[PDB]
């Protein structure tokens, strides 16, 4: 029978009131023979009725993919409410229930450090600006770079790594062309920061 | 029906002739009604006959788990040979085939850079020594720390991240509250598959 996956909102969306955080219930391997699928949504077990179901997509393996999207309130997500997606289909015996919520436990503020390229790296045409983000909890976080107020997007960021004290860390690497707008900033968004946002700059 | 999982050797094992790299074929959810399983192994499609298949193991959920281990030659793995486990069981319609190999592509040598703690971090009781390992391919790699020739184990390493040029990078962080610290990296594209970069204070 078909299978269900339930996805949390993107971290950046929960942390800024101007954005729209969402929970996404994805159904895979929906067949032509049994192609009707229903959705019930529950917030802390309380049925909700504001979910919107997206258009199914026939996949190259002759299966169907169905998606239901529920908008959540920023503070419901951040206060630890649970969201339950129930999927009904007559090919499945019982309805499938999946639940998700923010990780439990005391949020911890990230410390942000910018580290310049090793002197050795300059023997290459591009050097790496590093941003160490450590000690945060939970692991939901967003990291971006900018210079002179505009985004710098030639960066990659590691996933969060569980550290030995139960907090998380990550690094973000901005690749720059060695000439050094000599001022670069690492921007970090996390629920435990004041105004959910902080910047740490790097001279060159 | 039963399921097959095929595991590669540990990166360190392919890189040192003193270690013994192995490919491991694990079969789960074998039933009592049809519990005989046969393994056939192939290297680049040519059947090989030196795998060591262990005794089936009844699990607490009343399934059996059978595992077969094929020792591989270091240079076969690094030369990109494909290892195929074929698993036969009377409960299966057809035999299950799983194949594994080193990631395809031209190997690229890692650059290793050690970065000292931000001076700001010292206002806390523990500081982070950073080891940047970038530009490597494939992503199979080993990273370790030592000081004064002995292992240092208060470190964590990120998984490899695909960079924009198709190579990988990672960071490794050593937490210290031995003034010479070394980040050691093993990778197929390095000379003698090993390099070190040290950091004072
Ligand atoms: C027909 O083709 C489609 C499209 O390729 C296949 O759909 C994929 O099926 C696989 C497994 O059947 C799914 O793998 C799962 O991915 C999950 C997350 O990734 C998806 O969701 C996010 C949504 O934002 C995307 O960013 C991402 O790119 C993917 O779209 C994982 O969470 C799943 O993990 C679960 O199972 C593993 C089992 O080990 C556990 O470790 C986990 O805890 C968890 O239980 C899983 O890895 C994949 O998501 C499907 N893609 C889509 C788009 O739905 C069909 O499988 C294929 N049909 C066949 C082959 O018969």
């Amino acid at each position: 029978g078909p299978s269900v996956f339930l996805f949390p909102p993107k971290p950046k969306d929960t942390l800024m009131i101007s954005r729209t955080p969402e929970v996404t219930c994805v159904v895979v391997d929906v067949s032509h023979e049994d192609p009707e699928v229903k959705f019930n949504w529950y917030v802390d077990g309380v049925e909700v009725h504001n979910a919107k179901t997206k258009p199914r997509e026939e996949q190259y393996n002759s299966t169907y993919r169905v998606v239901s999207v529920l908008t959540v309130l920023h503070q419901d997500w951040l206060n630890g409410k649970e969201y339950k997606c129930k999927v009904s289909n007559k090919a499945l015996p019982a309805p499938i229930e999946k639940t998700i919520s923010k990780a439990k436990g005391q949020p911890r503020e990230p410390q942000v450090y910018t580290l310049p390229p090793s002197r050795d790296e300059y023997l290459y045409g591009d050097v790496s600006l590093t941003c160490l983000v450590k000690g945060f909890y939970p692991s939901d976080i967003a990291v971006e770079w900018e210079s002179n107020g505009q985004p710098e997007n030639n960066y990659k960021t590691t996933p969060p790594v569980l550290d030995s004290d139960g907090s998380f860390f990550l690094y973000s690497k901005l690749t720059v062309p060695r000439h050094s707008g000599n001022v670069f900033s690492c921007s970090v968004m996390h629920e435990a920061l004041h105004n959910h946002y902080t910047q740490k700059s790097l001279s060159l």
Side-chain angles (χ1 to χ4, degrees), chain A:
Chain A
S3 302
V4 178
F5 308 81
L6 188 59
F7 297 94
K10 302 295 182 304
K12 206 184 174 177
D13 299 345
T14 60
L15 298 177
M16 298 190 308
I17 193 72
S18 55
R19 296 187 67 89
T20 298
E22 304 169 339
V23 170
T24 307
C25 191
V26 181
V27 187
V28 297
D29 295 331
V30 179
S31 74
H32 295 68
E33 282 101 335
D34 289 284
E36 307 176 336
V37 348
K38 160 75 180 158
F39 293 94
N40 298 94
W41 283 91
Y42 308 84
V43 175
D44 282 349
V46 182
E47 186 166 9
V48 295
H49 307 112
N50 49 79
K52 301 179 203 177
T53 291
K54 284 215 81 175
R56 74 174 62 195
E57 312 169 76
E58 200 189 7
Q59 305 302 302
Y60 272 69
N61 47 37
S62 300
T63 64
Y64 286 110
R65 174 183 180 267
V66 194
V67 182
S68 176
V69 183
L70 170 59
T71 301
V72 308
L73 300 180
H74 303 70
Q75 225 52 28
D76 288 353
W77 179 261
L78 293 173
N79 284 335
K81 291 209 193 325
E82 289 180 334
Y83 296 85
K84 183 193 303 178
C85 173
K86 176 192 287 186
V87 182
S88 295
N89 181 348
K90 308 324 175 301
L92 295 167
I96 295 176
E97 295 188 10
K98 299 292 195 210
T99 305
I100 197 165
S101 61
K102 195 188 73 140
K104 299 169 208 171
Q106 165 76 71
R108 301 161 72 169
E109 184 179 43
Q111 314 153 49
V112 183
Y113 303 112
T114 52
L115 309 178
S118 174
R119 189 70 201 170
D120 291 339
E121 200 179 8
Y122 284 93
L123 314 189
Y124 288 64
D126 299 327
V127 294
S128 304
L129 310 191
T130 296
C131 181
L132 165 58
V133 187
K134 59 165 298 197
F136 56 99
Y137 190 92
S139 65
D140 305 304
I141 198 164
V143 186
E144 286 164 17
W145 293 80
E146 54 175 77
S147 64
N148 299 123
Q150 285 81 37
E152 282 270 4
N153 269 62
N154 196 0
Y155 63 87
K156 296 281 175 175
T157 305
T158 75
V161 181
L162 183 63
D163 218 338
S164 42
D165 67 7
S167 67
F168 290 87
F169 73 93
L170 61 69
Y171 290 85
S172 179
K173 189 176 62 71
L174 178 65
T175 307
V176 141
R178 191 186 172 183
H179 304 292
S180 42
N182 52 341
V183 68
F184 293 94
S185 296
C186 179
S187 286
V188 175
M189 300 175 64
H190 187 271
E191 71 154 289
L193 292 160
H194 186 52
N195 286 321
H196 298 166
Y197 180 84
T198 194
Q199 276 176 218
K200 199 83 169 238
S201 56
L202 191 62
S203 66
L204 58 91

